[PDB]
Design a protein around this ligand. Structure first.
Ligand SMILES: [Zn+2]
Lengths: 419, 7
């Protein structure tokens, strides 16, 4: 079974349904862009992101960065972007772990918390896009996830979203539509020895990161943020296990350490883990309380009873006779654990059977240009490490020296750090 | 996504 039922071509004619010109709810004006609905609640916009941040509206030019204002400007590039992103969703979905994450993402509808009257339930407009219909008029469509190209810095990938004036949607349990800046057209080099990979002065990047991992990393953030359980970026770990990090004063957010998982997540101590678990449990209780107060729905597209069921399913709430919702602590702890401990970069690596950075606490080595679209280069099932070839063994497909036709090095980062 | 973004 496939996650993406249509193998879209960029030049396929608009239909106003799953191939359409759209606008996103950014502050300020934008012209519509052509977008593709690859799955319920998930769209792909094959454009550079000059839209989500007002201060990031152009594509001109930090050690680890890469600029090219012309990338993703042509139709062929946008066709290959769509096929590349589609192939990576399929690679993710082909694993049991990735099917679980993607199900959680689709179920993670952003909360209808836009009403200021507590007897009324209402959508928040920034968790929608506006879609041009065949008659030229717009309709509003709710969605959970948008994959978009990077902004000026091509290799700055990130899972971001529109705020609310008052509510912290990624941290209050509500969730918000997530926009992931991502490219399948580049990847990163890392070193197979830990002591080299974590040293800013050594290594040229012999192995290449499988872009499925990189996309999964951003999807794990999107899961946190859709469930409104992201850890505030101002909660950070003062790294004290890397002499180079300490000289630079480099701190790493708890949200990143969680997302990576493995040993990195254990830098968050038990007291703090318990603190966050209680904090978000209290948010889920607030959501149950809010749903119980709501006696009407705003709008005509969905019934109150349907939307109450959507959020019962999202938050795994208990519903008694009255139809009253409560949060069961065991079910909360289970879902919270799933989202935060089961869906991790380290666990994806195990499912994909790839070589990868061993820690988030490293130094990048290089950026490579790649093309994952041709099945002779990369597959859903095997990534670069093609079965029944010289590339199947020992991660030889990720070995940029052995599989050199698959990688062109664009830039070295070793030595550029101030060390 | 990388830690050195914060430098
Ligand atoms: Zn991250």
């Amino acid at each position: 079974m496939q996650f993406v039922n249509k193998q879209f071509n960029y030049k396929d004619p608009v239909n106003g349904v799953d191939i359409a010109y759209i606008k996103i709810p950014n502050v300020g004006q934008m012209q519509p862009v052509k977008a593709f609905k690859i799955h319920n609640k998930i769209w792909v916009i094959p454009e550079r992101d000059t839209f989500t941040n007002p201060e990031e509206g152009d594509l001109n030019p930090v050690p680890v960065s890469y600029y090219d204002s012309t990338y993703l400007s042509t139709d062929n590039e946008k066709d290959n972007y769509l096929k590349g992103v589609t192939k990576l969703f399929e690679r993710i979905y082909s694993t049991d772990l990735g099917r679980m994450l993607l199900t959680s993402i689709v179920r993670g509808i952003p909360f209808w918390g836009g009403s200021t009257i507590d007897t009324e339930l209402k959508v928040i407009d920034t968790n929608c896009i506006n879609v041009i219909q065949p008659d030229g008029s717009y309709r509003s469509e709710e969605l959970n996830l948008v994959i978009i190209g990077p902004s000026a810095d091509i290799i700055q990938f990130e899972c971001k979203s529109f705020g609310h004036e008052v509510l912290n949607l990624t941290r209050n349990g509500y969730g918000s539509t997530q926009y992931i800046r991502f490219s399948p057209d580049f990847t990163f080099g890392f070193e197979e020895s830990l002591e080299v990979d974590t040293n800013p002065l050594l290594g040229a990047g012999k192995f290449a990161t499988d872009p499925a991992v990189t996309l999964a990393h951003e999807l794990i953030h999107a899961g946190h943020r859709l469930y409104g359980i992201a850890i505030n970026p101002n909660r950070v770990f003062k790294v004290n296990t890397n002499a180079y990090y300490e000289m630079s004063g480099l701190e790493v957010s708890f949200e990143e350490l969680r997302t990576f998982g493995g040993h990195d997540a254990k830098f968050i101590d038990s007291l703090q883990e318990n603190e966050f678990r209680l904090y978000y449990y209290n948010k889920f209780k607030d959501i149950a309380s809010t749903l119980n107060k709501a006696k009407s729905i705003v709008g005509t597209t969905a019934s109150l009873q349907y939307m109450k069921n959507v959020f019962k399913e999202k938050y795994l709430l208990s519903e008694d006779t009255s139809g009253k919702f409560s949060v069961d602590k065991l079910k909360f702890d289970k879902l919270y654990k799933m989202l935060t401990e089961i869906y991790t970069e380290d666990n994806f690596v195990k499912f994909f059977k790839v070589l990868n950075r061993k820690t988030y606490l490293n130094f990048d080595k290089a950026v490579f240009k790649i093309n994952i679209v041709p099945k002779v280069n990369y597959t859903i099932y095997d990534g670069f490490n093609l079965r029944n070839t010289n590339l199947a063994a020992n991660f030889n497909g990720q070995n940029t020296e052995i599989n050199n036709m698959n990688f062109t090095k664009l830039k070295n980062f070793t030595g550029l750090f101030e060390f | 996504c990388r830690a050195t973004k914060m430098l």
